[PDB]
Design a binder for this molecule. Structure first.
Ligand code: CLA
Ligand code: CLA
Ligand code: CLA
Ligand code: CLA
Ligand code: CLA
Ligand code: CLA
Ligand code: CLA
Ligand SMILES: CCCCCCCCCCCCCCCCCC(=O)OC[C@H](CO[C@@H]1O[C@H](CO)[C@H](O)[C@H](O)[C@H]1O)OC(=O)CCCCCCCCCCCCCCCCC
Ligand code: KC1
Ligand code: KC1
Ligand SMILES: CC1=C(/C=C/C(C)=C/C=C/C(C)=C/C=C/C=C(C)/C=C/C=C(C)/C=C/C2=C(C)CCCC2(C)C)C(C)(C)CCC1
Lengths: 125, 168, 159, 185, 177, 50, 98
């Protein structure tokens, strides 16, 4: 498996939070997290601090690290990820979850109106 | 969910409810024995509390200090405890019973597990094995209801100044 | 510790309860240092108890802004409410500057507080006789001062 | 085994590893009949904060040990003066309200406690490890052997924990009674 | 055997910026670690300037309270009102102009020392009078200057606060509290 | 790094060779390093004479 | 320059180098970030009394260069001109001499 995701100390990031990160992050980005992605910071620190590495940190460095990691609440859960993965699928499939404008906003009516007409490239169909 | 505790199951239109929407069981699984013990002991006391507030209104104990009017549920406490009084007679009694629970489960309540919780061993009415499951849920469902009932009784009765069974 | 002074002659190693019968040089160092310091303080205290009664009451005013002169204040337990607490604070603070400073010591000797009030290093058995005499005087002073204070509590003051 | 802060400080910092003991091998758990590892809410599972929590427990116990002794002694003796006389402040608890703000006494205590805390604050965050937590070098009567050092450490914690609880009753009983040292009705 | 422990605060290691400086490696007092966040040279310059200002100001307050005055009826004011009265009189503005030119020179000294253009010690302005020739003598003389400066800073603080709180000349001995 | 004889806490002003005050080189602000000091000398002499 | 004694080490030897310092500070990990304003972020390995100045690094030369920027030059000159006009108006109001 991936090297830096093994035996990562709980003090760096908790187990459940790390699993939530891995779920939210797309699979192809685990090996080399991009940049400005919580997984990038997890890699850049778990490769410095761990069992076989520097086991201690200055209080301020650890404080700053704890404010760079996710706080276990800013990550989408499985049902939210399903919501997105299915909403985008609907939108790209030419179907729109029907919504109706309201008082500065719109109520979702819970209906799938097929949006693209018989001529999918026609604007008025 | 919560070991094999009977709080869920036989719980209404759905067979099982399993209401733990904070995760106080999954987060602290070592305390499911403690939580049941506390939940049951809360229910039993609340049920005696609600059935309490009503019966003094008709009969009064022969202690001859409790044998006085105007001792409603907003003043009986602060009145009986004296310079000692009846409230200490009750508290000492509750100490005697609670000491028995210590002996059965050890001093640190190490023997307290998810099946012996809230089981003092007083078996007179129950029969069979499935009824014990049915009665255990009937216990809690009554117990949880009275815990909210006496909560409403105490708050509404003393806020709106009712002090009697309607508590309105 | 059967040679570290204090064993003069009337009795030898006086350790009935054996409070120093283990060999803890650190604990004995703390014990001897506190013993010597108490002897010194009791020596000044007992001298401070006898004199203001006998003679020598200081001339001026202790607190001119309150009129209180040294003569007016009582001599003994009871003066702790007549000497102003600000004066007691100054007594504590000065003795602090002489106990935790001017006489703060470590890795030197039992109670060789260095400065002191002149830096002076002696030699020979004469040091032993004088140092043992200081311990003997301090022990007598420590017993005496608690006697004076305890008696005054149950005899008032003076004769 | 009480490494001096001079060297002990070389292993200080936010430890990122787990000792595997109850609370990173810290004193305070050993009870009378055996061990009484207490933490039921699992605060010590956040091992990175165990040195911090021990510092807070010692700091609270030390304040409470003085604070409880605080509510006792004014009831039997007071500072020589009129502002502290038994007639101006009858009970001890009506002192934060009497001697405070423009009065001067409590305000000066706040400042000088602030000065000490702002000076000894770098030891609480930096230089604070699971070994030198609460150790401010003031080791005079500390025993030398390791097991007896544990007893004194255990003695302080149990006394500090007791005073923390005892002070809570002290102010609560006093305020509901307005009575001298034995705050019983 | 480990950290160079500070002599003042025994439970806090001495800051490395306090090495080899006057005062400093005799007490090493810096628990809040200001020397760990600012240049030690600038801190020492500010400390010496404050010490000198306070040593002048304390003696000025003593002299004014004890009754020493300039031979002018415009100066027959208390030390508390001396600042406002002399600001309205004029000499405070002129004193500020003169201290401004002297501080322009001091600012040039700081700029040319921090940039390394010169080899100036933090508080050194070149004045060498009653200064011991021996290096240890110079070090202990600078120690005496620092100690007196700090004492005068605290003393002037107390003098001003007590004088404002109790309208009273410098000794404050009579007072009422 | 030498210092000026006049103000000993400041660096010795370069470009101030011997004209008059070469023994007490005095240029704290540093106009001689900013301007043609021959013009500065001319201005100083004219000011002094006037 | 400012880290003449830090025992600065690379990520590859986070747990390998232990020689502390001329002080007793443990070695610091240097991370080469790509930001130009923060080219290198240094990470600690333990408690340390490291002197990290929070003050900026300015010098007289580039401060004067900034004041030599055309905005500062043409703002100082125009500010002095406007102030001189205002002072002349205060001292010789209503142009009575004309
Ligand atoms: C203080 C009273 C108290 C206590 C200690 C418990 C304890 C328990 N309840 Mg419970 N319950 C209560 C009141 C209480 N209940 C009331 C009043 C109701 C009616 C709304 C219910 C309805 C209820 C259901 C429907 C179920 C439980 C279940 C449980 C168990 C697992 C959930 C858990 O961890 O709860 C612990 C919660 C706390 C300690 C929170 C206390 C209140 C905080 C501080 C606010 C546990 C033994 C479940 C069970 O038995 O699983 C099989 C289950 O399915 N309870
Ligand atoms: C104030 C009321 C009260 C009363 C009347 C009792 C009475 C008793 N307790 Mg008890 N106990 C009390 C409060 C009280 N307890 C409290 C507040 C606690 C702490 C939660 C305990 C914890 C406790 C333990 C742990 C034990 C007792 C035991 C006992 C019995 C020993 C008899 C004895 O020594 O008599 C004089 C006795 C029936 C013992 C017993 O019988 O249990 C096996 C025992 O081991 N008690
Ligand atoms: C603070 C006082 C103090 C201290 C720290 C010491 C300490 C010491 N003394 Mg010492 N001593 C003292 C007072 C003190 N003494 C007094 C007042 C006398 C006169 C009787 C003596 C007479 C004496 C002799 C003759 C000898 C010592 C020796 C020693 C050393 C070894 C013995 C030992 O372990 O004692 C440890 C110290 C103690 C255990 C002191 C405990 C005293 C308790 C607190 C109270 C005692 C009763 C008290 C009067 C009760 C007050 C009543 C009130 C509470 C109601 C040790 C360093 C011996 C020595 O030189 O060893 C080489 C030795 O030969 N001492
Ligand atoms: C532990 C040592 C000690 C302590 C706490 C005191 C404490 C006190 N002494 Mg005292 N005194 C001491 C040693 C001590 N003395 C010694 C060794 C001598 C002999 C020279 C004296 C001679 C002495 C006189 C003659 C007088 C006091 C007085 C006093 C009281 C007023 C404070 C003062 O002016 O003291 C001054 C103390 C010193 C300058 C120390 C030398 C105060 C209760 C006054 C008083 O009324 O007594 C109750 C007073 O007039 N003291
Ligand atoms: C304007 C006030 C002022 C300033 C800037 C300084 C500056 C300094 N002092 Mg200092 N000091 C002062 C007043 C001041 N002192 C006074 C009044 C006292 C008497 C209590 C002392 C007593 C003192 C001691 C005993 C020691 C210092 C030391 C130091 C140096 C290191 C301390 C540090 O990090 O900065 C201190 C920064 C401040 C005080 C800023 C004020 C913070 C508030 C907001 C530094 C040059 C140490 C030294 O000599 O090492 C070089 C040292 O050991 N000081
Ligand atoms: C070395 C410095 C020094 C010294 C010797 C004293 C000495 C004294 N102060 Mg003082 N004080 C100091 C610094 C000092 N203070 C500082 C830095 C402040 C804060 C700015 C104060 C604020 C202060 C107050 C507010 C009062 C004193 C008072 C007193 C006197 C009791 C005593 C003579 C009291 C006094 O003189 O009574 C009128 C008093 O009321 N002081
Ligand atoms: C070349 C233009 C010029 C000249 C000759 C003066 C001349 C004068 N100004 Mg002036 N001033 C100017 C520009 C000028 N100023 C500018 C651009 C501003 C910015 C708003 C000011 C703001 C200003 C104020 C606020 C005051 C003066 C005052 C004065 C008089 C006293 C000297 C002084 O305080 O220095 C002036 C300082 C500067 C020019 C430096 C600005 C930075 C003096 C006649 C003072 C006065 O009236 O004295 C009674 C006064 O209170 N001036
Ligand atoms: C009135 C203004 C007073 C505020 C400024 C006073 C402090 C100025 C700091 C100072 O002069 O030294 C701070 C700097 C010296 O800064 C030096 O800079 C060097 C750059 O190569 C290096 O970084 C040196 O380490 C650093 O000491 O001095 C300046 O030149 C300040 C210019 C004037 C700033 C206004
Ligand atoms: C407005 C406050 C309120 C009350 C007062 C109330 C009361 C009871 N609820 Mg209830 N409830 C909500 C709110 C309230 N419920 C909400 C917002 C939801 C959506 C999440 C919800 C859902 C369920 C489900 C799924 C079940 C359930 C139960 C019971 C029950 C047990 C009766 C019996 O078993 O003795 C009683 C008394 C169980 C069931 O039996 O319902 C009959 C069960 O399965 N509830
Ligand atoms: C040179 C430094 C110095 C000064 C300048 C100074 C000044 C005053 N001292 Mg002090 N003093 C010492 C040093 C100095 N004292 C020292 C080293 C000691 C040895 C412990 C000492 C002892 C006492 C005692 C025992 C008392 C006392 C007091 C006063 C007082 C009165 C105020 C007033 O007149 O109202 C004033 C002005 C008396 C008092 O009444 O204080 C309220 C009093 O009780 N002092
Ligand atoms: C502070 C600040 C602010 C404010 C600002 C302002 C508001 C400004 C304004 C300003 C102004 C608004 C100014 C004005 C000025 C004016 C002037 C300066 C005038 C001038 C004039 C002149 C110069 C004239 C001249 C003349 C004459 C007189 C005669 C001849 C002709 C002529 C016309 C030339 C804010 C808050 C925003 C932010 C922060 C900072």
């Amino acid at each position: 498996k991936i090297a830096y995701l093994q035996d990562i100390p709980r003090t760096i990031v908790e187990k459940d939070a790390l699993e939530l990160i891995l779920k939210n992050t797309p699979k192809e980005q685990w090996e080399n997290p991009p940049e400005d992605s919580y997984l990038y910071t997890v890699k850049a620190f778990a490769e410095m601090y761990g069992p076989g590495k520097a086991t201690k940190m200055g209080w301020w460095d650890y404080y700053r690290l704890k404010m760079d990691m996710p706080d276990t609440t800013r990550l989408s859960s499985e049902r939210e990820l399903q919501e997105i993965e299915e909403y985008e699928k609907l939108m790209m499939s030419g179907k729109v979850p029907f919504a109706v404008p309201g008082p500065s906003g719109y109520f979702f009516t819970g209906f799938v109106t097929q949006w693209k007409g018989k001529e999918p490239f026609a604007g008025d169909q | 969910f919560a070991g094999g505790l009977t709080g869920s199951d036989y719980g209404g239109f759905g067979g099982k409810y399993e209401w733990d929407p904070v995760g106080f069981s999954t987060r602290w699984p070592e305390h499911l024995a403690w939580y049941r013990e506390a939940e049951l002991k809360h229910g039993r006391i609340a049920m005696l509390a609600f059935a309490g507030l009503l019966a003094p209104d008709l009969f009064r104990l022969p202690w001859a200090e409790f044998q006085d009017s105007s001792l409603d549920f907003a003043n009986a406490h602060d009145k009986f405890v004296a310079g000692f009084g009846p409230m200490w007679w009750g508290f000492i009694a509750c100490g005697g019973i609670e000491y028995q629970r210590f002996r059965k489960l050890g001093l640190g309540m190490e023997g307290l597990t998810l099946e012996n919780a809230g089981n003092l061993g007083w078996f007179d009415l129950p029969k069979n094995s499935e009824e014990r499951l049915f009665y255990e849920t009937a216990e809690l469902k009554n117990g949880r209801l009275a815990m909210l009932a006496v909560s409403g009784i105490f708050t509404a009765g003393i806020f709106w100044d009712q002090h009697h069974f309607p508590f309105i | 510790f059967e040679n570290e002074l204090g064993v003069q002659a009337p009795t030898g190693f006086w350790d009935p309860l054996g409070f120093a019968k283990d060999g803890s040089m650190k604990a004995f160092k703390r014990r001897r240092a506190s013993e010597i310091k108490h002897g010194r303080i009791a020596m000044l205290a007992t001298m401070g108890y006898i004199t203001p009664e006998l003679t020598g009451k200081f001339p001026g005013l202790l607190s001119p802004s309150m009129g209180l002169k040294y003569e007016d204040i009582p001599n003994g337990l009871g003066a702790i409410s007549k000497v102003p607490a600000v004066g007691w604070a100054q007594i504590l603070a000065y003795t602090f500057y002489c106990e935790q400073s001017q006489d703060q010591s470590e890795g030197s000797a039992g109670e060789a507080g260095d400065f002191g009030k002149v830096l002076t290093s002696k030699d020979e058995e004469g040091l032993k006789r004088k140092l043992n005499s200081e311990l003997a005087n301090g022990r007598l002073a420590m017993m005496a001062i608690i006697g004076m204070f305890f008696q005054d509590g149950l005899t008032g003051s003076a004769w | 085994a009480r490494r001096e802060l001079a060297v002990a400080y070389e292993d200080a910092g936010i430890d990122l590893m787990d000792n595997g003991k109850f609370a990173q091998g810290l004193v305070g758990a050993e009870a009378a009949f055996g061990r009484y590892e207490f933490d039921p809410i699992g605060f010590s599972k956040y091992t990175e904060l165990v040195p911090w929590f021990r510092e807070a427990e010692l700091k609270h116990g030390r304040i409470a040990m003085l604070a409880w002794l605080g509510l006792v002694v004014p009831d039997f003796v007071r500072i020589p003066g009129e502002a502290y006389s038994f007639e101006a402040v009858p009970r001890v608890i009506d002192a934060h309200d009497a001697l405070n703000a423009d009065a001067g006494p409590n305000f000066q205590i706040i400042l000088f406690i602030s000065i000490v805390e702002l000076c000894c604050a770098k030891k609480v965050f930096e230089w604070n490890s699971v070994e030198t937590a609460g150790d401010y070098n003031l080791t005079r009567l500390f025993p030398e052997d390791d097991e007896a050092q544990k007893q004194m450490r255990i003695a302080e914690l149990k006394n500090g924990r007791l005073a923390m609880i005892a002070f809570g009753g002290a102010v609560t009983q006093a305020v509901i009674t307005g009575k001298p040292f034995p705050w019983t009705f | 055997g480990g950290y160079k422990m500070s002599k003042a605060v025994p439970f806090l290691p001495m800051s490395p910026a306090l090495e080899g400086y006057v005062g400093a490696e005799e007490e090493g007092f810096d628990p809040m670690g200001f020397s760990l966040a600012l240049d030690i040279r600038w801190l020492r310059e500010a400390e010496l300037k404050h010490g000198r200002i306070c040593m002048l100001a304390t003696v000025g307050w003593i002299a004014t309270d004890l009754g020493m005055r300039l031979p002018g009826p415009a100066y027959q004011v208390s030390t508390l009102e001396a600042h406002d009265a002399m600001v309205k009189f004029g000499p405070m503005a002129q004193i500020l102009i003169w201290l401004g030119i002297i501080e322009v020179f001091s600012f040039l000294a700081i700029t040319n020392m921090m940039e390394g253009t010169t080899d100036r010690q933090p508080g050194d302005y070149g004045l060498r009078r009653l200064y011991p020739k021996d290096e240890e003598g110079q070090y202990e003389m600078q120690l005496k200057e620092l100690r007196n400066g700090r004492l005068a800073m605290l003393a002037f603080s107390g003098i001003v606060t007590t004088a404002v709180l109790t309208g009273r000349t410098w000794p404050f001995x009579x007072x009422x509290x | 790094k030498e210092t000026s004889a006049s103000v000993p806490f400041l660096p010795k002003p370069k470009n101030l060779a011997g004209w008059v005050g070469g023994e007490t080189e005095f240029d704290p602000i540093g106009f001689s390093n900013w301007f043609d000091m021959k013009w500065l000398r001319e201005a100083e002499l004219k000011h002094g004479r006037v | 320059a400012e880290t003449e004694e830090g025992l600065i080490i690379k990520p590859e030897e986070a747990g390998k180098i232990t020689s502390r310092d001329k002080n007793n500070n443990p070695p610091r990990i240097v991370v080469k970030t790509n930001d130009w304003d923060i080219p290198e972020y240094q990470l600690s390995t333990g408690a340390s009394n490291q002197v990290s100045y929070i003050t900026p690094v300015v010098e007289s030369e580039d401060i004067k260069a900034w004041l030599s920027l055309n905005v500062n030059f043409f703002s100082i000159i125009i500010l002095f001109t406007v102030g001189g006009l205002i002072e002349i108006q205060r001292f010789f109001p209503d142009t009575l001499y004309w």
